[PDB]
Amino acid sequence: AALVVDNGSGMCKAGFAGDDAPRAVFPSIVGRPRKDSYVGDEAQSKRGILTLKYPIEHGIVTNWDDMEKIWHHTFYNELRVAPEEHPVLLTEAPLNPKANREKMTQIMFETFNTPAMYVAIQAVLSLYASGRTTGIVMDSGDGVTHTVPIYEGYALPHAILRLDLAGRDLTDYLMKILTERGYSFTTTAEREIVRDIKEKLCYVALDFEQEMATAASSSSLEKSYELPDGQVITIGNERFRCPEALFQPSFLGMESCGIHETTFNSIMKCDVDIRKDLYANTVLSGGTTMYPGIADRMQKEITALAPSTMKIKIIAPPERKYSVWIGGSILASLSTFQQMWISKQEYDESGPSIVHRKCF
Amino acid sequence: DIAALVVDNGSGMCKAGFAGDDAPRAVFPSIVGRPRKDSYVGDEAQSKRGILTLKYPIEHGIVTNWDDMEKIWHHTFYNELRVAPEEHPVLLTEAPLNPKANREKMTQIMFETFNTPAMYVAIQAVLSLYASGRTTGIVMDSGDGVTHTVPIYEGYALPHAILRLDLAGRDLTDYLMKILTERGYSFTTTAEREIVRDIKEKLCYVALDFEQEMATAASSSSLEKSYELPDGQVITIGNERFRCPEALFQPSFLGMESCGIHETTFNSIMKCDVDIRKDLYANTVLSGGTTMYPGIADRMQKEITALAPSTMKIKIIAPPERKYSVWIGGSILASLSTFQQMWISKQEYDESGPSIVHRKC
Ligand SMILES: Nc1ncnc2c1ncn2[C@@H]1O[C@H](COP(=O)(O)OP(=O)(O)OP(=O)(O)O)[C@@H](O)[C@H]1O
Ligand SMILES: Nc1ncnc2c1ncn2[C@@H]1O[C@H](COP(=O)(O)OP(=O)(O)OP(=O)(O)O)[C@@H](O)[C@H]1O
Numbered sequence: 001a002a003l004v005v006d007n008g009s010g011m012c013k014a015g016f017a018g019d020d021a022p023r024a025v026f027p028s029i030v031g032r033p034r035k036d037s038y039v040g041d042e043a044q045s046k047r048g049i050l051t052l053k054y055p056i057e058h059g060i061v062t063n064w065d066d067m068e069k070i071w072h073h074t075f076y077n078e079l080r081v082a083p084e085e086h087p088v089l090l091t092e093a094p095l096n097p098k099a100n101r102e103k104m105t106q107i108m109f110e111t112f113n114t115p116a117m118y119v120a121i122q123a124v125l126s127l128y129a130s131g132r133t134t135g136i137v138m139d140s141g142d143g144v145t146h147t148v149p150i151y152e153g154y155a156l157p158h159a160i161l162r163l164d165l166a167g168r169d170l171t172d173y174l175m176k177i178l179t180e181r182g183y184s185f186t187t188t189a190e191r192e193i194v195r196d197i198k199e200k201l202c203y204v205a206l207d208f209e210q211e212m213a214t215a216a217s218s219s220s221l222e223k224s225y226e227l228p229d230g231q232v233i234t235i236g237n238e239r240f241r242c243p244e245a246l247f248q249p250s251f252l253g254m255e256s257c258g259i260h261e262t263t264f265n266s267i268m269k270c271d272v273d274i275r276k277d278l279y280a281n282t283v284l285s286g287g288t289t290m291y292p293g294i295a296d297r298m299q300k301e302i303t304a305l306a307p308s309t310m311k312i313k314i315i316a317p318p319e320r321k322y323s324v325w326i327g328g329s330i331l332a333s334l335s336t337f338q339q340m341w342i343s344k345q346e347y348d349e350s351g352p353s354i355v356h357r358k359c360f
Numbered sequence: 361d362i363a364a365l366v367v368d369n370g371s372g373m374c375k376a377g378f379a380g381d382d383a384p385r386a387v388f389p390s391i392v393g394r395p396r397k398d399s400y401v402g403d404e405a406q407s408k409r410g411i412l413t414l415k416y417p418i419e420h421g422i423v424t425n426w427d428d429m430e431k432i433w434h435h436t437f438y439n440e441l442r443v444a445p446e447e448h449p450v451l452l453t454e455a456p457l458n459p460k461a462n463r464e465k466m467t468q469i470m471f472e473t474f475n476t477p478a479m480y481v482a483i484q485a486v487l488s489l490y491a492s493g494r495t496t497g498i499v500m501d502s503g504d505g506v507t508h509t510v511p512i513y514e515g516y517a518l519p520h521a522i523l524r525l526d527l528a529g530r531d532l533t534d535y536l537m538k539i540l541t542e543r544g545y546s547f548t549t550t551a552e553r554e555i556v557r558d559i560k561e562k563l564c565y566v567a568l569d570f571e572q573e574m575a576t577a578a579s580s581s582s583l584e585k586s587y588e589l590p591d592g593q594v595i596t597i598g599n600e601r602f603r604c605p606e607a608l609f610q611p612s613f614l615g616m617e618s619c620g621i622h623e624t625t626f627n628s629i630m631k632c633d634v635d636i637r638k639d640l641y642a643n644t645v646l647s648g649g650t651t652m653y654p655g656i657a658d659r660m661q662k663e664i665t666a667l668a669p670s671t672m673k674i675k676i677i678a679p680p681e682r683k684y685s686v687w688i689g690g691s692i693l694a695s696l697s698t699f700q701q702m703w704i705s706k707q708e709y710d711e712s713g714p715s716i717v718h719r720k721c
């Protein structure tokens with residue numbers, strides 16, 4: 001049955017429609033020496049002898065030879081399947097240019113000979129996975145954050161906002177502020193540590209200025225992190241300062257609005273009629289929305305921006321790290337969907353532009 | 361505020377109006393007549409029946425003559441609605457299972473002949489379900505020329521599960537004409553056909569239990585009703601009242617092989633995956649003039665209930681405004697703020713030719 005490939009700036013997720021989870025998740029990295037290319041964990045573990053390139057920049061593909069290598073690796077290496085035997089559902093960023101969507105289609109039929117394929121907007125899948133066709137998706141990943149208003153299955157272009165602030169940026173920041181504390185993480189292995197601390201110990205303060213005040217006057221918020229070798233390194237206010245940068249992006253030297261303001265602006269950019277539904281259906285997705293306390297904080301921040309009237313509801317599924325993928329698995333495994341596949345016949349008739357009839 | 365145009369093409373009648381309105385402004389017979397000014401459409405063509413050759417360009421929901429359909433749309437814009445079509449977006453409707461080739465042509469005509477700034481094509485059934493406030497359910501749409509059963513799920517018609525029944529209003533009027541002749545009335549003239557139709561629309565009803573009602577008709581006159589003609593001549597009608605629309609359930613009455621409307625609906629539901637049937641059974645929506653019979657909803661309820669698994673919650677929704685529910689759906693859909701995203705622009709037409717319509721969604 002169908003393949004589901006969720007291309008990401010940091011990681012790709014691949015598996016089979018109908019499964020609870022992707023069977024493979026690997027770094028979106030292509031390495032070349034001076035075999036003539038390696039992808040993923042294999043490339044990383046040969047870092048010292050390969051030139052590394054990241055083909056997906058901020059959700060958008062910028063190098064097509066490398067992206068084809070990732071897909072080749074996905075099929076013949078990770079999933080160990082013949083692509084000419086399975087329908088393939090691929091995902092795309094919001095506001096992906098038509099030119100890109102056509103190239104994806106071209107590669108699938110012409111290089112991989114897929115019998116059928118489809119391209120869905122990642123955000124629409126996340127909303128789908130939550131059992132909705134209307135709402136606003138806040139998707140924060142490794143490379144980008146998007147706020148994507150959706151109404152009855154239709155993502156609204158005029159109202160989509162992009163924020164080039166995500167996971168990398170947060171890991172980068174935690175690295176910087178731990179250095180402050182007297183720790184040093186210059187190597188690439190030491191970066192894996194920082195990222196681990198970020199994913200295990202960080203959290204969003206409800207009230208940031210009080211949280212600062214508590215930390216300055218109490219140790220009740222400090223937690224210790226144990227390294228492989230047994231070395232324990234203590235983390236204090238950097239636990240909540242790091243993710244705070246999502247709400248106060250000046251922390252990273254950036255001249256952009258927080259995630260909360262950006263969400264509000266996206267809603268505000270819609271016709272006054274559907275806002276009630278967007279406000280009451282704000283859905284969080286992506287690894288960078290995984291911090292404890294984030295949903296409470298969003299609730300409070302949006303509440304503060306929105307008219308008093310509005311019921312505000314933030315939905316933060318526990319499955320949200322993979323909600324894009326799980327959406328793809330749900331969509332591609334419905335019999336009611338098998339109608340929506342774009343076949344080799346239609347492509348050899350209409351060519352790469354037929355893909356724009358994606359209703360997802 | 362510039363309102364979009366909503367044109368519901370139909371086998372018997374076309375309905376036209378402006379998005380936002382409760383109702384189409386114009387409803388007129390889908391007829392193009394030509395003599396042997398060189399063409400007339402609608403009521404104007406009928407009233408000159410004697411000197412024109414009338415043709416029906418929409419046979420069973422599907423356009424079969426493009427020259428004539430073009431005339432119908434010209435008449436709609438410039439004659440019935442009195443608008444320049446290049447000032448307004450146009451939403452047109454199409455039958456279920458409309459071939460790709462016909463969609464292309466519709467699109468071509470709109471941009472190339474009528475210079476519309478934007479257009480959109482919706483499946484009639486999907487609009488009926490939409491007008492009822494739903495995105496999931498099954499629509500039983502019975503009109504003048506055709507009956508379709510159309511399962512829809514989350515805004516999407518399931519074409520594999522769509523069933524077509526070439527039995528509708530025309531067939532029922534023809535039948536009532538036959539059985540009224542049985543009793544000793546003559547309705548030969550086309551004028552007189554208007555009478556039979558009128559009787560069909562005013563006095564007919566669906567019996568809940570047919571055989572029972574036959575016996576009621578046989579044993580007292582309590583079911584007889586009299587119809588008065590313009591000239592004052594009264595004609596009485598008894599069992600023909602319910603026998604006529606019964607043909608929808610028992611098509612053998614018309615000499616036809618086909619299953620009834622209730623079987624057809626059931627089969628359509630059965631053709632769908634089991635994990636959605638619960639929803640289809642609970643959301644069965646009736647649309648089209650031929651579903652206007654009193655008693656029809658009760659009868660469907662009982663008939664489907666008899667066919668369906670016993671555990672199943674059956675619900676037949678028969679809106680009062682169901683004669684125009686297709687149109688009302690179009691007017692709802694086009695009056696939406698997010699409609700603009702959904703349509704095809706003039707810009708996209710210069711770009712991707714008339715095939716743009718398989719590339720829309
Ligand atoms: N428990 C966690 N808490 C905080 N952040 C996390 C957690 N787990 C993963 N992340 C972060 O989420 C990011 C990856 O998430 P995701 O897979 O949604 O993004 P992506 O799809 O690779 O990239 P993008 O969507 O930006 O193109 C990484 O930066 C990672 O550090
Ligand atoms: N009140 C009524 N009771 C019974 N039948 C009616 C009533 N009103 C209209 N009809 C019948 O319905 C038919 C017209 O239906 P409608 O306009 O919904 O469909 P259409 O678009 O003309 O046909 P098609 O579905 O084939 O495209 C005519 O045969 C008409 O006599």
Ligand SMILES: [Ca+2]
Binds near residue numbers: 007
């Ligand atoms: Ca992603």
Ligand SMILES: [Ca+2]
Binds near residue numbers: 370371484503504648
């Ligand atoms: Ca109709």
